[PDB]
Design a protein around this ligand. Structure first.
Ligand SMILES: [Zn+2]
Lengths: 60, 121, 193, 85, 43
RNA sequence: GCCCCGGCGAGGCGCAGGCAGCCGUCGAACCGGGGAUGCCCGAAUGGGACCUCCCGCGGCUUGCCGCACUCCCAGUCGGGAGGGGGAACGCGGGGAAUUGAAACAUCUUAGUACCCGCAGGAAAAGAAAGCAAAAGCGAUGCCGUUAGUAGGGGCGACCGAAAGCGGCACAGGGCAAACUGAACCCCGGGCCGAAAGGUUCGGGGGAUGUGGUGUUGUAGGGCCCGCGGAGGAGCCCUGGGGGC
RNA sequence: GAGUACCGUCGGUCGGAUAUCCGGCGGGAAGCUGGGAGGCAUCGGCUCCCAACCCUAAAUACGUCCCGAGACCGAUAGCGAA
């Protein structure tokens, strides 16, 4: 999940991926109350990447 | 009724003054502006002077009546600056004009001179 | 022409047609606000010597101030007898300068150039003030006045840079007697004026 | 508020479990700035259900808590199981 | 050399300044006219 | 904590010596540079604040833009400005008492502490209606002397300069008026051109004077009358070199 | 280049003393054959200047920051705060 791949795609796919990632994050934070404690961090930063690059595109 | 106004002037004589100004603009010579009119009266190249009645402040034209009485030159009044400037051929008003070398306007000039002389006296 | 005659009419208003004009004008002015904008100057030659052009960016204002001096408030703590006085004090700024500062308070985007006296009553004096808009291109394009769009020229009237402030600071003198006024009053421990 | 940006967490406590079993209700920790209509749309869109009632409170930890009742056609147990619980 | 200094006004825009007298201009035409009329006697 | 261009060259995940795990050879962490995101209050500004939270009106398409006060240019379309903050230094106003005089009232403390207003990276000043004295100098500012001197003062306690001389550093320019009389300035659009510039189409100003000229001591300038030419000086960077 | 220069009176300030500067009040010019200064006021000479409009770099003052240094202190010391 890197800009190399992200910048190869279109905008609709990016928004869809953001959506599914946010749902994943909510579910993982739900279970965290009750392995691999870095899933949340990596999800957050993937979301940030996607938004940054989508904005680069929609600005140019 | 500002105080530099020394006598009343009928609409007829005012119209005649404006028409003389327009005719002499076309053909003869015209000095537009209070500074130029004052220079003309001080030198002695002016036949008829036209003042406006709606000038504020008064300090701008209040010297012309006495200066013209001294230099024995005739002057008349008109009620608006916009019309005076429009007949002088300008896109701006004018508080005073002087006609010089009237061409095809001597008729009106002489008539206005006599009328305004008997009006002052 | 047309300026010498105004000068001569205004050099003494009692000996001219100006006294009566002024009495009537003041009857009306007494009814107007303390700071009022006007369309044209009253003393055109006076305006044109101090700096005034028929251009966009020049504003003329008339200001009314009360005559006389000042009265100090009543000291509440104890004072020695040389520090008790209340009634016989005079301002160190001139009424002209005070009037310019009033106009500047009312017009917060302009700068004062100069001012001139235009009338006197038993209770009131009148001054006309020339202002300039330093953000207008017609002004930025005129070298006679383009300096005023600099960074060290805002607050002129408040720091003392108009002719009235120069005069009340004491900078029209030179040589014997002017030892304590330059380069500033603060530079000499306030001992000038 | 925009959907997918409203819900922070599901809640699984003894009280929430009792409610899922006895009243067809889910319980969520939600953003402070979201309203009942936004919460309704969020739950609907993110889980493809129909919502009958939303109740809200602010806790003494600064988090907004929402009790969402589902219509009887649906079953909150399936949504809870499909979630991490 | 009478090369201009470039300064900025109250706003963000740029003015030309003479290095011999301190005058301030907005246009090269005016700067040139001034530099030639006021200091041409320097040859 | 997200992205990109360069550097360095294998480890990295703050003060902070832990557990479980992730990122990195597609060149990370780190360093220089440039971008994105940037909740509420606050000059706080669509309107209200006994609680950093609330309540709206228009226009478009649920998401977005506009909607404060005092003004300028305009004009019922729009385009602009100001407010607040900043250690010390800066400019302009208002202004005590302790204390000393072995008491104290003129005086001193002191144009001091404090108060109000206004600016900047420096501010203020600045180009003789001057200083001098049988000789002359040549804007302003700063340093060393002049000097505890001239002089002020219950002539008490105390207060207190300047010119000149030696140095640092150097620079001079523009208006108003007289004479001309629209030959003028800005704003927006379109054409040429790398830019500077040029050329057009409208609108706003201006005869209550835009523009040109001119700026000084027995003077300078204008007006009037004659001779005349080649040398000056700036703005911009398609391009080519060089140094930081 | 006019309520200006100047005259008188009051208040403040100054080393400025009958000869400092600012302000208020009452009077108030000439304006190129013109005007001002030269430490009480006036007269005559001699010398020096041309106010009442505007702008201006460098040499200076400071250090909330940065760089460098020290016959400075060495944890009750040194900035209140290692
Ligand atoms: Zn110059």
């Amino acid at each position: 999940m890197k800009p190399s791949e992200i910048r190869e795609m279109s905008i609709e796919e990016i928004d869809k991926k953001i959506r599914e990632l946010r749902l994943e994050l909510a579910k993982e934070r739900g279970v965290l109350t009750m392995e691999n404690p870095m899933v949340i961090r990596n999800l957050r930063r993937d979301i940030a990447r996607l938004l940054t690059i989508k904005r680069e595109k929609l600005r140019e | 009724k500002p105080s530099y106004v020394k006598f009343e002037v009928p609409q007829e004589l005012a119209e005649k003054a404006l028409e003389a100004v327009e005719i002499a603009r076309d053909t003869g010579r015209i000095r537009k502006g209070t500074n130029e009119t004052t220079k003309a009266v001080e030198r002695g190249q002016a036949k008829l002077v036209i003042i406006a009645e709606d000038v504020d402040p008064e300090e701008i034209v209040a010297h012309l009546p006495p200066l013209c009485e001294e230099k024995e030159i005739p002057y008349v009044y008109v009620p608006s600056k916009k019309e005076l400037g429009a007949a002088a051929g300008l896109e701006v008003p004018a508080a005073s004009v002087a006609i010089i070398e009237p061409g095809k306007a001597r008729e009106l000039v002489e008539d206005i001179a006599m009328k305004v002389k008997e009006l002052m006296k | 022409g047309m300026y010498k005659y105004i000068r001569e009419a205004w050099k003494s208003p009692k000996k001219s047609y100006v006294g009566e004009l002024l009495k009537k004008r003041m009857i009306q002015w007494r009814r107007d606000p303390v700071v009022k904008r006007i369309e044209r100057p009253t003393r055109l030659d006076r305006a044109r010597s101090l700096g005034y052009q028929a251009k966009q960016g020049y504003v003329v204002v008339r200001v009314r101030v009360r005559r006389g001096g000042r009265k100090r408030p009543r000291w509440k703590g104890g004072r020695k007898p040389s520090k008790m006085g209340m009634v016989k004090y005079s301002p160190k700024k001139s009424l002209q300068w005070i009037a310019e500062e009033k106009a500047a308070r009312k017009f917060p985007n302009l700068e004062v150039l100069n001012s001139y006296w235009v009338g006197e009553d038993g209770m009131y004096k009148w001054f006309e003030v020339i202002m300039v808009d330093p953000h207008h291109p017609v002004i930025k394009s005129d070298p006679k006045i383009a300096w005023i769009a600099g960074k060290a020229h805002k607050g002129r009237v408040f720091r003392g840079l108009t002719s009235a402030g120069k005069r009340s600071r004491g900078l029209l003198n030179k040589g014997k007697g002017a030892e304590k006024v330059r380069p500033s009053i603060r530079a000499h421990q306030g001992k000038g004026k | 508020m925009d959907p997918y940006k409203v819900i922070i967490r599901p809640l699984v406590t003894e009280k929430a479990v009792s409610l899922i079993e006895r009243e067809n209700k889910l319980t969520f920790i939600v953003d402070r700035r979201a309203t009942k209509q936004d919460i309704k749309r969020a739950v609907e869109e993110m889980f493809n259900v129909k919502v009958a009632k939303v109740n809200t409170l602010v806790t003494m930890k600064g988090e907004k808590k929402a009790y969402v009742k589902l219509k009887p056609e649906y079953d909150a147990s399936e949504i809870a199981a499909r979630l991490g619980l | 050399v009478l090369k201009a200094i470039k300064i900025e006004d109250r706003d963000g825009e740029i003015l030309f300044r003479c290095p011999r007298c301190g005058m301030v201009f907005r246009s090269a035409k005016a700067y040139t006219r001034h530099v030639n009329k006021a200091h041409g006697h320097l040859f």
